[PDB]
Every structure is written in C-alpha cells, then in structure tokens.
Amino acid sequence: QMKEEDVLKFLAAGTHLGGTNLDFQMEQYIYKRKSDGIYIINLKRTWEKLLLAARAIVAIENPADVSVISSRNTGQRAVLKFAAATGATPIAGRFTPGTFTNQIQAAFREPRLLVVTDPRADHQPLTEASYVNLPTIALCNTDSPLRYVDIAIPCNNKGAHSVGLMWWMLAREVLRMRGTISREHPWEVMPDLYFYR
Numbered sequence: 510q511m512k513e514e515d516v517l518k519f520l521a522a523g524t525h526l527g528g529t530n531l532d533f534q535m536e537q538y539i540y541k542r543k544s545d546g547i548y549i550i551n552l553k554r555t556w557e558k559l560l561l562a563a564r565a566i567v568a569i570e571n572p573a574d575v576s577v578i579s580s581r582n583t584g585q586r587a588v589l590k591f592a593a594a595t596g597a598t599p600i601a602g603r604f605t606p607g608t609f610t611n612q613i614q615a616a617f618r619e620p621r622l623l624v625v626t627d628p629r630a631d632h633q634p635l636t637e638a639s640y641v642n643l644p645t646i647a648l649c650n651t652d653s654p655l656r657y658v659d660i661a662i663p664c665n666n667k668g669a670h671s672v673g674l675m676w677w678m679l680a681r682e683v684l685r686m687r688g689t690i691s692r693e694h695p696w697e698v699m700p701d702l703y704f705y706r
Contacts, residue, residue, distance in 0.1 A: 511556040515678070518700065522670035525550045527651030534655040538663035548651040550663050558662040559675075562624070562646045563682035565660060569622050572596030576620035578634050580604060583669050584626035587676035587703040594680045594698070597624075600634070609637035622646070624679075627666050628653045648675050673703035 519525060527539060527548035538558075540551040569575050575597040577588045585601035592599035598620065600608075612618065623638050624646040625631035631647070635657035638645050647658040648666035655661050662679075665671035677700045684690045 511553060514695070515556070516552065518674060518678075519552050519555070522665070522674040522700075523668050524555060524665050524671045524674060525552055526665045526668065526671070528667075530652035532652055532655060534661070535649065535651050535653065535663060538649075538661070539651060550651065550665065555662065555664050558660065559678055559682060562660050562662055563679060563686055565644075565646065566595075566597075566622060566624070566679075566683050567686045571621075573598050574619055574621040575624065576600060576622070576634075577624045578604065578631050579626035579672075580633075581627055581630045583667075583705050584672045584676065586705050587673045588626065590703050591676045591680045595683050604631070604634050606633055606637075609634060609643060610640050612641070618643075626672060626676075628655070628658055632657070648672070669705045670700075673705065674700045677703040 527550050529546040531548055538551055538554040539548045541549050566575050572595060577591050577597045578600045579585050579588045588599045588601050623634060623643050625635060626648055628635055628647045628649060635645055639657045644659045645657060646660040648664050649658060649661040650666045664675050681696045685692045690696055
C-alpha cells in the first residue's frame with residue numbers, strides 16, 4: 510500500500526538511514542544492520558505509522574489543538590509549513606519550560622495532541638506532556654528514546670531532507686484524510702518547501 514513514488518522519495522532523502530545504536534523499542538521497526546554498524550529502518554513501518562499518526566491528528570476536532578514542535582533548526586521550517594497547511598499550532602525553536610505544566614485552568618486543556626521532530630532534542634515538551642497526560646507523536650530514529658512517545662514514526666529524523674519529507678508526507682496524509690486534497694493523484698506542494706537549507 511506504500512506507493513512506488515513514495516519509496517523513491519524516501520530513498521532520495523535517506524529516510525531508511527538509522528544510527529549505530531538501537532533502542533529496544535525501536536527493534537520492531539528496523540530491517541537490518543550494515544557492516545558499518547548503521548541500522549536500516551523498515552520503510553513499510555515508517556509508512557504504517559505515518560498513517561496511524563495522520564489518523565490521530567485528523568481526529569482532533571479543532572486543528573489548532575494539535576501542536577507541532579521542532580527545537581532543532583532542521584525541522585523548524587517543516588513544522589511551520591505543516592502548521593500553515595493543516596491548521597496546527599507550531600512551536601519552532603525554543604520551548605520555554607513550563608509551557609505545558611504551568612497551567613491555571615483545569616478545564617479545556619490545550620494542546621490536545623503533541624507532535625515532535627526529535628524526542629532527544631524535544632525532550633522538554635514530551636516530558637511536560639507526560640506530566641499533563643498530553644498524547645504524543647514523534648519522528649523516531651533507531652536510538653530515539655520512546656519513553657514519552659505514544660505513537661513512534663520510525664525514520665531518519667536527523668538529516669534535513671528526511672525531516673522535511675516526513676513532515677511533508679504527514680501533512681499530505683492529513684489533508685488526504687480530511688478530503689482537502691486528492692487521495693489518488695500527486696500533491697501540488699513539493700517536499701523541498703519543507704527542507705531546511
């Protein structure tokens with residue numbers, strides 16, 4: 510159900526490229542390890558989890574109640590573009606500690622869903638999310654900690670092209686599930702708009 514053209518995009522971006530270390534909860538998503546020690550990510554799992562994540566994001570009735578995060582420069586443009594495209598609320602760059610935990614109101618807590626670029630770099634929002642029972646989604650590399658991640662999308666979340674492509678693909682699938690764009694023909698927005706230079 511993964512399309513040929515998407516496989517080629519993944520390949521060009523190096524999305525299958527993990528690192529030399531493997532978190533025990535990421536073992537289920539890798540395919541093989543090369544002699545240089547690099548773990549190869551199973552892209553069928555990438556695709557399945559992208560769809561699961563898009564489904565969860567689409568179930569949030571007010572689009573602004575999904576927050577999308579990248580502290581790293583690598584994912585900042587991507588999260589801003591994802592947010593523009595889908596109506597999600599971006600936090601690109603610094604996340605001030607207490608943004609989630611310093612809360613007056615018990616009622617109508619927001620965000621209702623958190624999506625982050627890198628559980629290691631974005632540990633603060635993810636840890637705060639666990640304190641306040643905010644469900645989370647993350648792009649996860651082979652050595653990513655999954656402690657605070659509810660839905661892990663296995664991928665190269667280090668390389669600029671792969672990070673940009675992942676956010677672009679998430680956006681495309683969210684828009685497809687909403688019926689905002691065509692489920693059949695290619696999307697007019699190109700991945701390179703999401704890439705950090």
